[PDB]
Design a protein around this ligand. Structure first.
Ligand SMILES: Nc1ncnc2c1ncn2[C@@H]1O[C@H](COP(=O)(O)OP(=O)(O)O)[C@@H](O)[C@H]1O
Ligand SMILES: Nc1ncnc2c1ncn2[C@@H]1O[C@H](COP(=O)(O)OP(=O)(O)O)[C@@H](O)[C@H]1O
Ligand SMILES: Nc1ncnc2c1ncn2[C@@H]1O[C@H](COP(=O)(O)OP(=O)(O)O)[C@@H](O)[C@H]1O
Ligand SMILES: [Mg+2]
Ligand SMILES: [Mg+2]
Ligand SMILES: [Mg+2]
Lengths: 162, 371, 371, 371
């Protein structure tokens, strides 16, 4: 449905923050991961116009720029059944990011935001956008468990070593 | 009622009202995300500094520019800087005053189409207009003819223009500019060991450059003065306190404008692409372009740049007739000031791009408004 | 309702409620078993004294510390001391009030993982939080920037931090601290014959140290004053009655902070690992770290320690710009007081580690809470 | 008659004769003073050990490196190590054989000027020559084109070069290298409690690093293997006897080459500054640079480093065309072996820097010998 549309390569490398940045306690990882997905889905100008402004027109009510619009976006994410026409337009974007040409480089960095920044600390209770965008990049959706484990205690030998 | 004029500078966003002599606020075009822990609980907010507050706090930020080479790249950040212009530092409602964006010639179309689409559908300004950089600078001259060496932070370009009429085929444009100066100055400080690596130090390299670097009148004979290095070196205090000094690297950096092979780009220097522009122009105008050369843009605030190109174009011109280099003392703001004039003309209020004619036109309306 | 803050001191456990100015109870972190016959029949009970009652009864006990080098070693005794805090001296139910443990940076992970597992599965506190030592001490400063020479009884460490944001790679940490002072003071009392051998005498060495030892402004020139030994010596009454005196050993002991080769550890002194931390920090912050150096921790209560490091960092800094040493008169309690502030902030009650989120997380939850 | 080639390694001095396949002697670039009493009367001599004898005796020495970041700092010690090369381990008279020093690109000029002045006016060699590191490594390839990821102990750098001709403006250089790996490995051993503090332990950290650390193919998915920590951990016997073990810290340390934000330096990884170098090169050469990527230097002996960057540059390149990573099995000695070739060419004996042309030239002669 959005055929004839493409993106420029490596469009998001300036946007992904440092690892010491995302180890912050005042780091609301939602609006900076979406801000990566916003920049990563910036359509290349080689796409023709009538598919460009439609796909951009789908974006502004899905991935807004202002911090009050995305905070307003989460408000209907609690009752996504009662908002079908925006909920139905979301899986279109999920279909687009499924065929994204740098999907693996996204999917490598997408769950790098999940562990180091704690993006997926709800694990099944995250809202509708962070659910399917990760499910757009991670096919099996196996991100539910796995970042929580960190191999806490094991001492196969001697005590403190000096 | 009044109009705003806001030169989208590649390095320094210059902005202000129409009819004002000086631009109201000039701040560097820097957006910056922080890059560290933030173990404080209160000061961890404001996750993206922009402008002067990113300039002062530059030690903990990854300073990135939204515009490179005159082409607006990061449109998400470019909203953030324009929101900082209108609300945060001009304190004006953008929906009430008309704006006037400015841009370089020969940039991509989508740099212009997105720029108007992000102006109406985000800021809802009543009317806008996009101007070529150098054709504003003749309004700053108060003179209707002559080419312009408009060298900015991101791009340099020549727009030859006779009285009224421009020469669109003879517009030449080189991407060598102040960032390519700054990046080459970073390369040659390492020869003296002053290794300045990251973006915070890339900022203070420009403070070295704008305070110290002059361009030489005769490059080789003044290089030979640096052989008997007696009085060439000055010395600059870094923000930490330790001091540097710099010798032949002080003038060898702005010779990139004249020998672009120093940064290895295969081109003619800005003295020669001047003459290559005037040779492209028709033969009657060439007498008047030689008498009318407007230096413009903040890169051309190097001391000695007027005395150099007046010498060097004379080497290329036929020597039977005179050359002039019109270098005013307001070259840094010349694009804005000419932009401040053009919005104030009574014959201009029909030349805008209104919203009521935008809505049936779409973003291609600016291509039928002065190309 | 209210929270408890209990700094797990390496030498002195400091504890109290949130929002209180002074910590409620400060007692030395000493557990001690008796070591003799006990031929009395009634007084033979209470086979492990801890805290002040181990301090007064120190002559018949083997006084051992549960924490060495900031690392909690004997977890069996570490329960016994925390049970003494909550029940025996604060008289509060731990199941009702939230706690806030504090710890050094760069300690092992199991020092943190066991500490939370022994907090929930033993004391059943509602919510806990673990804080880095020195980042609490800036809350005691009421100032959001500057490195901290937080030298405790067991470890010293520097946490450089700009406004909000810390520098995790530039955190430096040396194990030289007050016990390494005390052990070296025991070595140099033997040069005057005052052989203090075992742990009861190791306690009274610290009473010699905290009452007498000052650090010299200029080490060699004030050593030469001890050559003409006229007014340097003071004299200290031991608990039995016989009196000692001490000369050049009074200031030569706290020079271990500056010459760590005295105890033979190959390191830079705390004046130099200060500067080595600030050189690791980025170049913009260095101007502000030099103006903001917070002495903290009980080891830095030596008289003259501020006048020394202000002199000595000045020897290492570029002399064109100023240095400051922020040494408040509450440095002994600065980690607690800043800990008392941080628990009292209204923006902090979402930053805890609750039990209801612990149960599906396990002890690795503190690694995703401020590292 | 024959020439010597002696790669001034930032970590390991590699040396030997011209035309030899293997370098004659490889010893670590460590000078070390002792730091203790020496109450023996006979063995107190030789107050500065250097090389392998400083390596074996490393427990009583303050091991310091003369070269950091590819820049020779301590010129007094740098004489001592070169005197150890010629006399103590090669046993050759330096006045008879020509030498060939090697160095990194973009180092300071005084690192080159002093290096030739300390070569003639101290060792009196007949003729010398200074070579860029990576341009020697193509001679080891036997191939005349392609960029080189020459990552040493002290610096990594890319020298893109087409057949014959180099690209001087596209030479990129990052200071992240094996010492920055070693220092970060010391930071992350403390998370498992293995506190290795001083320079003797900094040596044995490198023995941990070179024997154990591999780089991961996919960082996050192989980090998730360390969550179910079953077969990742190996275990290493320290020189005292007590054994360590290491889990996710084994591969997380060489990810500093790819995420330089781990040590907090704001840069692109060596996979990306590869691609940033090739984008700087002209458009015809880019097809051949992608087919010709030479890994070189001892840092790139990590297992899996070729399989990683072949994957990761493929993520950055346009996928329509192939990539190759030329990782020979002699990458540790590739700079020497290519240096051994270049001195042996019959077309090279006019390319030296002789003493008879030095004497009227002074130390600036090397700036007119291959920059
Ligand atoms: N006084 C000065 N001396 C030398 N260089 C200067 C001076 N002022 C500005 N510059 C250079 O000019 C640049 C500013 O150009 P700018 O006005 O932003 O061009 P544009 O507005 O077209 O982007 C700065 O980046 C700086 O490098
Ligand atoms: N007034 C003082 N004068 C000198 N030294 C002191 C003084 N008070 C405490 N100290 C030293 O500081 C140590 C206490 O440090 P403390 O604040 O308990 O650190 P921590 O809480 O990290 O254990 C004691 O061992 C003592 O030697
Ligand atoms: N086989 C190996 N496996 C892993 N790391 C290695 C190996 N060999 C060398 N290194 C690392 O590479 C560095 C040696 O690099 P080197 O070739 O000496 O660079 P240079 O010669 O420019 O000094 C050492 O720090 C060592 O840690
Ligand atoms: Mg300009
Ligand atoms: Mg303390
Ligand atoms: Mg080497």
């Amino acid at each position: 449905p959005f055929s004839g549309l493409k993106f420029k390569q490596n469009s998001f490398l300036s946007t992904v923050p440092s690892v010491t940045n995302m180890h912050s306690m005042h780091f609301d990882a939602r609006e900076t991961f979406l801000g990566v997905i916003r920049k990563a889905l910036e359509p290349d100008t080689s796409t023709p116009f009538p598919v460009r402004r439609a796909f951009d027109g789908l974006r502004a009510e899905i991935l807004p720029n202002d911090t009050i619009k995305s905070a307003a976006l989460k408000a209907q994410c609690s009752d996504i059944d009662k908002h079908p026409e925006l909920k139905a337009k979301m899986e279109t974007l999920k279909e687009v990011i499924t065929h994204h040409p740098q999907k693996e480089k996204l999917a490598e960095i997408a769950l790098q935001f999940a562990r180091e920044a704690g993006l997926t600390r709800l694990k099944g209770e995250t809202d509708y956008v962070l659910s399917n965008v990760l499910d757009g990049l991670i096919g099996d959706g196996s991100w539910r468990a796995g970042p929580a484990y960190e191999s806490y205690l094991n001492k196969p030998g001697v005590d403190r070593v000096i | 009622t009044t109009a705003l004029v806001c030169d989208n500078g590649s390095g320094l966003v210059k902005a202000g009202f129409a009819g004002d002599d000086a631009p109201r606020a000039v701040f560097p075009s820097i957006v910056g995300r922080p890059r560290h822990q933030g173990v404080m609980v209160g000061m961890g907010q404001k996750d993206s500094y922009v402008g002067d507050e990113a300039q002062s706090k530059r030690g903990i930020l990854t300073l990135k520019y939204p515009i490179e080479h005159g082409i607006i790249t990061n449109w998400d950040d470019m909203e953030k800087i324009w929101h900082h212009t209108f609300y945060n530092e001009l304190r004006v409602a953008p929906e009430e005053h008309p704006t006037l964006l400015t841009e370089a010639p020969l940039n991509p179309k989508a740099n212009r189409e997105k720029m108007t689409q992000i102006m109406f559908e985000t800021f809802n300004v009543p009317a806008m207009y996009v101007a070529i950089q150098a054709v504003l600078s003749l309004y700053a001259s108060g003179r209707t003819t002559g080419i312009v060496l408009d060298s900015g932070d991101g791009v340099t370009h020549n727009v030859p223009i006779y009285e009224g009429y421009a020469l669109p085929h003879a517009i030449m444009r080189l991407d060598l500019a102040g960032r390519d100066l700054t990046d080459y100055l970073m390369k040659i400080l390492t020869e003296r060991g002053y290794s300045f690596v990251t973006t915070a130090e890339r900022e203070i390299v420009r403070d070295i450059k704008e305070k110290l670097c002059y361009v030489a009148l005769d490059f080789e004979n003044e290089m030979a003065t640096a052989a008997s290095s007696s009085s060439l070196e000055k010395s600059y205090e870094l923000p930490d306190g330790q001091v540097i000094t710099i010798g032949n690297e002080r003038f060898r950096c702005p010779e990139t404008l004249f020998q672009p092979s120093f940064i290895g780009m295969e081109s003619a220097g800005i003295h020669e692409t001047t003459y290559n522009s005037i040779m492209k122009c028709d033969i009657d105008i060439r007498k008047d372009l030689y008498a009318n050369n407007v230096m413009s843009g903040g890169t051309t605030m190097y001391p000695g740049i007027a005395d150099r190109m007046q010498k060097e174009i004379t080497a290329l011109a036929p020597s039977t007739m005179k050359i002039k280099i019109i270098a005013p003392p307001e070259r840094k703001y010349s694009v804005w000031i000419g932009g401040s004039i053009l919005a104030s003309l009574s014959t201009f209020q029909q030349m805008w791009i209104t919203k009521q004619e935008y809505d049936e036109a779409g973003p291609s309306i600016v291509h039928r408004k002065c190309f």
